[PDB]
Amino acid sequence: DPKYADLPGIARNEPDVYETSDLP
Amino acid sequence: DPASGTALQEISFWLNLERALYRIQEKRESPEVLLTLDILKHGKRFHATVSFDTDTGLKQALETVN
């Protein structure tokens, strides 16, 4: 998105949610 | 301020606040109106959603009215 391009530093191409797997 | 006017005007506008905010709540409770906020929340334009959930005095208004 352009709003997240116009700025100097942005996490481009990175997963946004870090979470443990299933199988509790 | 109920220092002026008649008591009838007061009773009538309290009742009018009831039915008015009542219908306003009916408007808000519709799924499309909420769906717009859902789209905004999906687009992360949190200004509108947060301002709509806290700046609208509808909560305290419905409380004090009821």
Binding site: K3, Y4, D6, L7, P8, G9, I10, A11, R12, E14, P15, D16, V17, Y18, E19, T20, P24 | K41, K44, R45, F46, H47, T49, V50, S51, T54, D55
Partner: protein, 370 residues
């Protein structure tokens, strides 16, 4: 009076600003004051003595940069006054200081004197109509569209974890440690001295900051990667030189997870997050583990959150769902959230009156600090 209020994030290394009701900070420039260290002879040279702003990066080979804010605490108050006036300058905002409510941010648990002196500046030099100082965490929750979470940020100089549950902040569970971006860059500078590059000037230090933001990356198991040689990235200096980094490209941001490397008994960032959770109650631990919100520029390291999951998972209880949300606008979460809170009427019912400040002083802001 109440015109469109102004949000200013005093990032200890990059100050972010703009008006409220906006959607992005259009005024982002690093936090320092660069004065020239050379001799003026040719008439028609650069303009002015101080060089705050983008002109600094444009002419960094002349300046002698000085940081005003070290570890969130202001040392050179005159520099912060010059920077704040530069925020109201003709190149940044053009408004007048007597026209807008100011939403200033602050790192948590900063000394009382810092707030007091900031109040003096904004109500004596600048004559603002209103002022409010808040935590940086709450703003990130506003910008991330949530209400419960543990904001674990890493600015350029202060990393901390504030666990907020349903809008209620738990002050006794706040953990703050002064080891962030500048220490990562400083440690990297020491490593380049041992690699034979001797960066010691001020402009050289900001080149180190550019390296840290571009060539470093975090580890997964520093021993698995320590026993094996790595990529050895080839970064090009603006001069045209060539530098190699080697294993220090992953050894440099290890300082965050382990301050023993810099010789400092403190906690890792993982220990800060885990302790901040465990300092709180018991009914909330599971929900706080499920909602970890990052922010702060020093969490943009590549391969960071994955190591954070392995670390916290190694520390948190068995099979608890740890869920870290890291958005793309982490760098401006505090600003965006400042815009969100400042675009409300509760903000009008939340700042500090100029008259009330004149009548009271420091006690006013320390009462309305939350």
């Amino acid at each position: 009076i109440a015109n469109q209020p102004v949000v200013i994030d005093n990032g200890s290394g990059v100050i972010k600003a703009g008006f409220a009701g906006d959607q992005i900070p259009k005024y982002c420039f690093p936090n320092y004051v660069g004065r020239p260290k050379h001799v003026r002879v040719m008439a028609g040279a650069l303009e002015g003595d101080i060089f705050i702003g983008p002109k600094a990066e444009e002419h960094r080979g002349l300046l002698s940069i000085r940081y005003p804010m070290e570890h969130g605490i202001v040392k050179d108050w005159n520099d912060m006054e010059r920077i704040w006036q530069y925020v109201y300058s003709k190149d940044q905002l053009q408004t007048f200081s007597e026209e807008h409510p100011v939403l200033l941010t602050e790192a948590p648990l900063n000394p009382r004197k810092n707030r007091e002196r900031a109040a003096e500046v904004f109500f004596e030099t600048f004559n603002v109509p209103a002022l409010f100082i808040s935590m940086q965490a709450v703003l990130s929750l506003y910008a991330t569209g949530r209400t419960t979470g543990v904001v674990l940020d890493s600015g350029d100089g202060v990393t901390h974890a504030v666990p907020i549950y349903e809008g209620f902040a738990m002050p006794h569970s706040i953990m703050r440690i002064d080891i962030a971006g500048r220490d990562v860059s400083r440690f990297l500078r020491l490593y380049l001295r041992k690699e034979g590059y001797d960066f010691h000037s001020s402009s050289e230090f900001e080149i180190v900051k550019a390296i840290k933001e571009r060539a470093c990356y975090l580890s997964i198991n520093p021993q698995k990667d320590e026993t094996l040689e790595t990529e050895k990235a080839q970064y090009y200096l603006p001069d045209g030189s060539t530098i190699e980094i080697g294993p220090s490209r992953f050894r440099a941001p290890e300082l965050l997870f382990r301050p023993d490397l810099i010789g400092e008994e403190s906690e890792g960032i993982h220990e800060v997050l885990v302790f901040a959770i465990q300092k709180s109650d018991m009914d909330l631990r599971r929900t706080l583990f499920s909602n970890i919100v990052l922010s702060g520029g020093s969490t943009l390291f590549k391969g960071f959150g994955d190591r954070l999951l392995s670390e916290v998972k190694k520390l948190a209880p068995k099979d608890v769902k740890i869920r870290i949300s890291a958005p793309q606008e982490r760098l401006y979460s505090t600003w965006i959230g400042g815009s969100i809170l400042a675009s409300l009427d509760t903000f009008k019912k939340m700042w500090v009156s100029k008259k009330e400040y004149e009548e009271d002083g420091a006690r006013s802001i320390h009462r309305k600090t939350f």
